[PDB]
């Protein structure tokens, strides 16, 4: 927009006595001082422009309740904004602030303040003057400390300080008894204040990517917690039965910490959670009976730990829908796996399995089975009953042949057999109606392909690189999968 077009918009706003002025997304460099005549405005939108300064005449808009300055190049604000005694929402995200503008601390009518993605380094004590703040966002700045005066914001409900450099929280934070959403992800927190337990309305606590080595015992008093994310810290234990007290917990993440065991407390601590993430720790066992009360537990991730076997009652996890045990030291899957009738995803990558239990074929709803990077020397005939299976990953195992029953996997679309010892594929491969991707690359003993492979009418991706295939015409295999399938098709019994 040119200066004249902006003035035309102001004049239209005046003539129509409009209470809303939207000048966003116009590449405006200068806001003309003529804005002073629009005293009836309650909402002024100027986001996504090129403003490097705001005219002091904006202070004449005494009726303003919303001022959005997002995505400009502002470094300051005129002191005349003192006169906006009714301002409720101020958005200064995506500017060039090295500080909270001095005048903002005097806008004590504010209930919503967005400072996200600037270069602010300090939160002055004067923050106490904004006692009506219910939503405060200082996400993605350079703040290294919060003043104790933050505890005077007793109406604070949502506080987002994600992506800063905080090492501690002032204990006075416990005076914000209304806080229900607290995001502290990606800071440098060494600990949490014991007063944190005062936040009895806290429902979401984001703490991923910090430096916590322990959780305060008083966190058990935040009984409204539904989402607790402790990913990537330095925690090895949880205080006595902390989880048992979180009666609304829906999902818990302990991944990327220092746990050698499950937190002590028994099955009472998992009675409500829907998903449990413990990947990338050093847990050496799943306790017997810890899920006996986990009636809604649907997703368990134990990837990259120290499991050498599964618990005796493994077969009782009838509500489990997604289970990840990759990168452990499992040498066998118990036959009791047949009890996981709700399991749809099973990840067993990078273990020490040489064979699979017969009970695997009872997982009637299993859709994804990842077995790459094991030592599998064969597949059980029971796999024929995995009728819901869509993806089967067997990359880098020791398979030489496939069970003929594999032809009953009519829902299978992805079959990854790369880096195996296959000598041939069963003729029943032709009944894989929905097969789309067949990876056979790096099978140095695979000298043939069955003509029935031409019957897979949805096959569009196949890799045979580094497969001998010496039983097929050399010029055929030299042409790649397109000529190979063509040969099997028009040279076979099914043309």
């Amino acid at each position: 927009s040119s200066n004249a077009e902006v003035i035309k918009e102001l004049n239209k706003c005046r003539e129509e006595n409009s209470m809303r002025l939207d000048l966003s997304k116009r590449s405006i460099h200068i806001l003309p001082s003529s804005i002073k005549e629009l005293t009836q405005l309650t909402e002024l939108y100027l986001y996504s422009n090129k403003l490097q300064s705001l005219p002091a005449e904006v202070g004449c808009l005494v009726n303003l309740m919303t001022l959005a300055l997002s995505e400009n190049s502002l470094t300051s604000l005129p002191d005349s904004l003192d006169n906006l005694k009714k301002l409720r929402m101020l958005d200064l995200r995506h500017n060039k602030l090295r500080e909270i503008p001095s005048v903002v601390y005097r806008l004590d009518s504010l209930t919503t303040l967005y400072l996200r993605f600037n270069r602010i380094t300090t939160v002055e004590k004067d923050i106490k003057n904004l006692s009506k703040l219910s939503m405060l966002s200082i996400r993605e700045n350079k703040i290294k400390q919060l003043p104790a005066e933050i505890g005077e914001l007793c109406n604070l409900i949502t506080l987002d300080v994600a992506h800063n450099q905080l090492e501690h929280l002032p204990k006075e934070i416990g005076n914000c008894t209304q806080i229900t959403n607290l995001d502290l992800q990606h800071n440098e927190l060494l600990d949490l204040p014991d007063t944190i337990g005062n936040l009895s309305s806290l429902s979401r606590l984001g703490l991923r990517y910090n430096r916590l080595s322990a959780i305060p015992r008083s966190l058990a008093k935040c009984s409204a917690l539904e989402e607790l994310n402790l990913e990537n810290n330095n925690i090895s234990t949880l205080p006595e039965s902390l989880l048992s007290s979180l009666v609304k917990l829906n999902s818990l993440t302990l991944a990327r910490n220092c746990f050698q065991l499950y937190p002590v407390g028994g099955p009472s601590q998992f009675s409500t959670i829907y998903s449990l993430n413990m990947e990338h720790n050093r847990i050496n066992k799943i306790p017997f009976g810890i899920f006996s009360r986990a009636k809604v537990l649907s997703k368990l991730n134990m990837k990259d730990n120290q499991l050498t076997s599964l618990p005796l009652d493994f077969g009782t996890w009838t509500s489990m829908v997604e289970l990840n045990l990759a990168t452990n030291q499992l040498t066998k899957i118990p036959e009791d796996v047949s009890g996981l009738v709700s399991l749809e995803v099973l990840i067993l990558s990078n273990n020490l399995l040489k064979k699979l239990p017969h009970g695997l074929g009872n997982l009637r709803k299993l859709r994804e089975l990842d077995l790459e990077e094991n030592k599998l020397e064969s597949l059980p005939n029971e796999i024929a009953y995995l009728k819901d299976l869509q993806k089967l990953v067997l990359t880098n195992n020791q398979l030489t042949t496939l069970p003929r029953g594999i032809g009953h996997l009519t829902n299978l679309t992805h079959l990854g057999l790369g880096e195996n010892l296959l000598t041939h594929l069963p003729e029943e491969i032709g009944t894989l109606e929905n097969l789309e991707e067949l990876y056979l690359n790096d099978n140095p003993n695979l000298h043939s392909l069955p003509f029935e492979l031409a019957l897979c009418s949805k096959l569009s991706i196949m890799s045979i690189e580094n497969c001998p295939l010496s039983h097929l015409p050399p010029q055929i295999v030299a042409g790649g999968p397109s000529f190979i399938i063509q040969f099997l098709k028009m040279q076979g019994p099914y043309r």
């Binding site: 996200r116 994600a162 979401r204 606590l205």
Partner: peptide, 14 residues
């Protein structure tokens, strides 16, 4: 969650 500006916040606990 998506804030009024359309940006996401509280990712990790939403």
């Amino acid at each position: 969650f998506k804030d009024w500006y359309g940006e996401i916040w509280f990712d990790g606990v939403c």
